[PDB]
């Protein structure tokens, strides 16, 4: 069976903007995308999911994730002073102007409940809302509040399913599925 390059897949499957933001994220975290290709893919995936989440209800969400750290932190600070929200330890992904809370998105090849627990413990914030997607359609949100309607989340799930099927047809899926730390 023919086995493809993950880097190739990423550059063909993801938006050049997304790929660039992922590239810069890997830059500023001291890791080589040419070696950690699965990670390149995961960061691209997370980015696309955050963007789709925001795009699901335009002008409701503030995007924190896409920006470079310094800009993202200025944006977070601004949101905090303007709204009165608790400043997070971590860069969250979104801000919900409707529900008045920061949102952390997660995308996992693992079991979503465990991943949710690890994410929650990793952020140490009782005010931040957590939403976890898997590639298999399963999801897990804070206090069973899934924020978006079934259709939007189905759009996201369909995208994830497609990414997985295209990974698998290139033989890339197994290494990716099992390389999650």
Ligand X SMILES: O=Cc1cc(Cc2ccccc2Cl)cc([N+](=O)[O-])c1O
The C-alpha R_g of the chain, in whole angstroms, comes to: 16
- Shortest distance, position 149 Cβ to Mn ion, whole Å: 23
**Which residue's CB is nearer to ligand X, number 48 or number 170?**
48
| Catalytic-labelled residue, pool 68, 86, 93, 180 | 93
Residues forming contacts to Mn ion in the complex (CB under 5 A) are 93
- Which part of the chain contacts ligand X (CB under 6 A), choosing from 4-12, 42-50, 74-82, 169-177? 42-50
Query: Does the annotation flag 46 for ligand binding?
Result: yes
Question: 80 touches which of ligand X, Mn ion, none (CB within 5 to 8 A by kind)?
Answer: none
Query: Does the annotation flag 31 for ligand binding?
Result: no
Paired tokens of 152: 């939007």
- Count of residues of this chain found to bind ligand X when the rule CB under 6 A is applied: 9
Distance between CA atoms of residues 141 and 135, nearest Å? 15
| Catalytic-labelled residue, pool 31, 62, 65, 68 | 65
Contacts of 32 (CB under 8 A, 6+ apart): 26
Does residue 96 have an active-site annotation?
A: no
Q: Is 90 in the site for ligand X (CB under 6 A)?
A: yes
Contacts 24+ apart (CB under 8 A), 54-58: 54/94, 56/148, 56/152, 56/155, 56/156, 57/98, 57/148, 57/152
The answer to whether residues 19 and 10 touch, using CB atoms and an 8 Å cutoff, is yes
- The pair phi, psi for residue 43, each rounded to 5°, is -65, -45
**Which residue's CB is nearer to ligand X, number 33 or number 85?**
33
CA-nearest of 46, 39, 60, 47 to 17 is 47
Query: 3-state SS of the chain: helix, strand, coil percent to 5?
Result: 50, 15, 35
Does residue 93 have an active-site annotation?
A: yes
Q: Is 28 in the site for ligand X (CB under 6 A)?
A: no
**Which residue's CB is nearer to ligand X, number 46 or number 101?**
46
Please select the residue that binds ligand X; options are 19, 21, 41, 43, rule is CB under 6 A: 43
Catalytic center residues: 65, 93
Annotation: binding site for Mn(2+) = 46, 65, 93, 104-105
């Amino acid at each position: 069976g023919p086995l493809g390059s993950m880097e190739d897949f990423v550059r063909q499957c993801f938006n050049p903007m997304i790929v660039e933001l992922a590239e810069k994220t890997m830059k500023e975290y001291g890791e080589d995308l040419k070696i950690e290709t699965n990670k390149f893919a995961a960061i691209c995936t997370h980015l696309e999911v955050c963007f789709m989440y925001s795009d699901a209800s335009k002008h409701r969400f503030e995007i924190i994730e896409g920006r470079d750290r310094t800009m993202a932190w200025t944006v977070v600070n601004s949101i905090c002073n303007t709204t009165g929200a608790e400043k997070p330890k971590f860069l969250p992904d979104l801000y919900d102007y409707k529900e008045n809370r920061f949102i952390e998105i997660g995308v996992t090849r693992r079991e979503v409940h465990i991943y949710y627990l690890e994410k929650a413990n990793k952020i140490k914030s009782e005010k931040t809302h957590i939403h976890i997607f898997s590639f298999t359609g399963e999801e897990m949100a804070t206090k069973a509040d899934y924020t978006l309607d079934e259709e939007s989340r189905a759009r996201i799930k369909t995208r994830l399913f497609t990414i997985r099927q295209e990974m698998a047809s290139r033989g890339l899926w197994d290494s990716f599925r099992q390389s999650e730390r």
